Design a protein around this ligand. Sequence first.
Ligand SMILES: [Zn+2]
Length: 7
Amino acid sequence: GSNQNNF
Ligand SMILES: [Zn+2]
């Protein structure tokens, strides 16, 4: 799957 981190 794809991943996104919004710090
Ligand atoms: Zn993946």
